[PDB]
Each structure stands twice: as C-alpha cells, then as structure tokens.
C-alpha cells in the first residue's frame, strides 16, 4: 500500500406518504465522495475525505469534509463531520420513521462543521469522543464521550455530552409588518445507555436516552426521557424484517408535559452489497393525532 483513493457514492430514491400530507418522491440524501488514505509510516496514516450530498432542493453542498490522522493511539478526525453521538447512534433500525428516542441531535441535527473526533478500538472495547470548536457564535459548542464493549452476543455502549447553540431558531416574531426569527441560547445535555442482543437471526436493541434542554437567560428547562426497543429478524436469505417502539416524555419546569410514541414495522431486502430495497409503516402518536405513514425506497451503492 502506498495508499488508496476510493470514489464512492449512494443513489437513494424514496417515496413517502405522511398522514394528512402530500406524498413525496425524491433523491435527497444521495451521496457522492472521495476517500483518500495515505500511509506515511507503519505508525501514521493520513485521510482526506469529502462527501457531497443533494439536499432536497436540487442544491448540491459539502455534507462532510475530513482530515484524519490514524496513529497507534486512535484516529483523530478534523473538519465538518457527523457527531460522535450520531456515529454511536442507538437502537433505531428504521429507514424512514424511527430514531425519535435518540435525543443527541435536537439542536445539532447530528452535524458540526468544525470538530475534532477521536476513536480508540481495542479488543471488542472502544472509546469515542468529540469536541466542536465554537466560533463567531455560528458554530455551536459540542463535547461528547461514549464507551462501548462487546461481551459475546451482547454489545453495549454508554455515554453522552452537551451541545449549546447560543442563537438557535425557536420561532418567528412579527411586529407591525416586519418579521424576524426568535433565537434562544439553548443547551442540550444528554446521556444514553444501549444494549444490543444477538440471538440467532434476531437482533434486539434497547436504548435509554435522557436529555435536558436548558435556555440561558430564560427560566425554561425541559427534561426528556426516552426509550427505544427495536429488533430485526432474518426471515430469508437477504431479507430482514424489522420493527421498533419509541416513547419519549418531555416535562417542562413550567409544568407542561408532552409525550410521543412512534412504532415502525418494515422489511429490508439487500439484493447485493450495492443495492437494497426497503418498505416501512410508521404509527405516530402523542399528546397533540394517530399519524399513519408509509415509505418505500431503494439504494444503489458504489
């Protein structure tokens, strides 16, 4: 190996039916990119990776750009990246409607444009951490730390962190005729424990998430407790069924409570490593009704 250059990509096309909403067709979250890896010596490799996505607006942007340094002490990755909390993720096995019980992304949307992320893998035991450099009060603050381990057929992880947006859009303000965004200074603090159990052709995952949204210079404080119970079952050769139940409750320090349930059931056929097809129903519900959703998609990879 001198190093490799890998052009890669994913063509995604999806049809979505959201209850009491107009169906959509599209190719958002289609990706294309370049992953270059260069070996300097037997204890130091470099990575440059860039990934372009499609938006849904036809506009094409840089979804990720990464400089990686691989050493005998883990990888350090700098640049615009998904959060460590997003890499670690949790017991959401959906393609369309799940993941409501994973609370790390409320402000960050799983992205920070200027982080350093760290990864150390030992013998079925790992550590992942990340720091988002705040700048010009455009870049949010982020600090994250997760640990995981595998014990036979049981894989576990825990961790969390804290994410602050000093100018987060929470709504809109109209005085007389002029309209301006309402920004708040919000901190999301969160912690998570996940266990995933492999039992034959079945996988069962449970994730507990806790979070607190704390506004600065404003009394509001919202606590969130979330559980996700999900599973996949190999029914045929390249066919998994999957399903999940997600419950989150939010309790505001002002006494207002909200909660929401999301259930999903679907099927995945992995034709080959480069193509897959999937379909899924979602039943949503919560205090404020009974949304019924359906989605079907296909992916080509290169």
- Annotated binding-site ranges for Ca(2+): 6-7, 302
Closest CA to 106 of 189, 178, 184, 5: 189
Distance from C-alpha of 29 to C-alpha of 98, rounded to nearest angstrom:
16
Q: Which is nearer to ligand C8E, 203 or 295 (CB)?
A: 203
Q: Which of 131, 168, 190, 209 binds ligand C8E (CB under 6 A)?
A: 131
- Tell me if 129 contacts ligand C8E by CB under 6 A: yes
Q: Which is nearer to ligand C8E, 121 or 201 (CB)?
A: 121
Distance from C-alpha of 121 to C-alpha of 107, rounded to nearest angstrom:
28
Q: Answer left, alpha or beta for residue 255, where phi above 0 means left and psi between -120 and 50 means alpha.
A: left
Burial class for 228, CB neighbours closer than 10 Å (0-12, 13-18, 19+):
buried
Region from 35-43, 47-55, 92-100, 143-151 binding ligand C8E, contact rule CB under 6 A: 143-151
Q: Which is nearer to ligand C8E, 205 or 284 (CB)?
A: 205
Nearest residue to ligand C8E, scored by beta-carbon proximity: 195
- Tell me if 226 contacts ligand C8E by CB under 6 A: no
> Rounded to the nearest 5 degrees, what angle is found at the Cα of 162, between the Cα atoms of 156 and 166?
155
Phi and psi (nearest 5°) for 84?
-50, -40
For 232, the enclosing helix (H) or strand (E) is: strand 221-236
Distance from C-alpha of 249 to C-alpha of 258, rounded to nearest angstrom:
6
- Tell me if 204 contacts ligand C8E by CB under 6 A: no
Q: Which of 145, 184, 263, 265 binds ligand C8E (CB under 6 A)?
A: 145
User: From the list Mg ion, ligand C8E, none, which binds 86 (C-beta under 5 to 8 Å, kind-based)?
Assistant: none
- Tell me if 74 contacts ligand C8E by CB under 6 A: no
Q: How far is the CB of 124 from Mg ion (least distance, A)?
A: 26
Residue 253: strand, helix, or coil: coil
- The residue ranges that bind ligand C8E (CB under 6 A) are 87-88, 116, 118-119, 121, 126, 128-131, 143-145, 148, 156, 161-162, 193, 195, 206
- The residue ranges that bind Mg ion (CB under 5 A) are 95
């Amino acid at each position: 190996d001198a190093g490799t250059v890998d052009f890669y990509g994913q063509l995604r096309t999806e049809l979505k039916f959201l209850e009491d909403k107009d169906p959509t067709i599209g190719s958002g979250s289609s990706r294309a990119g370049v992953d270059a890896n260069y070996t300097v010596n037997d204890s130091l490799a470099l990575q440059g990776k860039v990934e372009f996505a499609l938006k849904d607006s036809g506009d094409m942007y840089v979804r990720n750009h990464i400089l990686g340094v691989k050493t005998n002490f883990g990888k350090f990755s700098f640049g615009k990246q998904w959060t460590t909390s997003d890499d670690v993720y949790g017991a959401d096995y959906s393609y369309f409607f799940g993941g409501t019980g994973l609370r790390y992304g409320t402000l960050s949307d799983a992205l920070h444009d200027s982080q350093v992320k760290y990864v150390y893998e030992a013998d079925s035991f790992w550590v992942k951490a990340g720091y988002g450099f705040p700048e010009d009060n455009a870049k949010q603050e982020l600090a994250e730390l997760y640990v995981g381990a595998t014990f036979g057929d049981l894989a576990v992880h825990a961790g969390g962190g804290q994410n602050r947006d000093k100018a987060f859009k929470v709504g809109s303000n109209t005085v007389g005729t002029t309209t301006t965004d309402i920004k708040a200074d919000v901190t999301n603090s969160y912690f998570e424990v996940t266990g995933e159990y492999t039992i034959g052709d079945a996988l069962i995952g449970v994730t507990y998430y806790n979070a607190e949204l704390d506004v600065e210079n404003n009394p509001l404080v919202i606590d969130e407790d979330a559980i996700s119970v999900a599973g996949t079952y190999k029914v045929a050769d390249k066919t998994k069924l999957y399903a999940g139940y997600e419950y989150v409750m939010q309790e505001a320090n002002t006494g207002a409570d909200e909660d929401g349930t999301l259930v999903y059931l679907g099927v995945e056929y992995k034709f080959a490593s480069w193509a897959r097809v999937y379909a899924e129903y979602g039943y949503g519900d919560g205090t404020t009704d009974s949304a019924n959703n359906f989605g079907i998609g296909a992916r080509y990879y290169w």
